[PDB]
């Protein structure tokens, strides 16, 4: 249940 893909990933690798 621990989130393994941090939301910052989507914020930062989207363009």
């Amino acid at each position, epitope marked *: *249940k*621990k*989130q*393994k*893909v*941090h*939301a*910052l*990933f989507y*914020k*930062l*690798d*989207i*363009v």
Partner: antibody
Amino acid sequence: QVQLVQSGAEVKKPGASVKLSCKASGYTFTDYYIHWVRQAPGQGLEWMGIINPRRDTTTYAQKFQGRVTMTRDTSTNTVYMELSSLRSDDTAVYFCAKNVGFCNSDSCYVGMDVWGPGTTVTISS
Amino acid sequence: ELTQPPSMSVSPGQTARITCSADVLPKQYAYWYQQKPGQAPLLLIYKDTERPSGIPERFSGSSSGTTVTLTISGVQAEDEADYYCQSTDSSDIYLVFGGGTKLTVLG
């Protein structure tokens, strides 16, 4: 070995800006995010924000949105943090730190595995 | 927000247990750092329980519900320092540190 080299101590007057630098070596610069963290004298650590040098994208803590700017130079594997309209409350040591994990669609862990030594910034008239 | 005790004392050889608590921890990994005065923090524990290379096994980490705990065994004088937990906000975006725990080694 991963090393992060930070620019020397800064002394500023209230209202000025300061641009700090963090020069990374020993790993692939564009594979990892860089954090900035500050610590006022006697106090605790406070996260300021993060930059992804691959895509040149940033995110800052709510209290620093609007007065921090992080930038990067891949030619020199350097990250910069600019803080504007400095106040006495901005006196602190400013650290940069490499993100502990390589981030992709299958996995992204966000913490700091290697820290720079800190740049002292003193605000005084 | 992350709550850990501001301070804790222990005698040489004893075991220290520093806990950090917040509603968000069941869904977010935590990280533990050691900082000695005038030095850069040092990562002790990541993803709640994993210890980097170079960190001694005296340091271990555990998770339980809304708490995470750093355990130091065989405390030596050189473990006197500030220990910080770090995780992410209820926003799931912004990183937050605990207030830090000053560890005093008695004697």
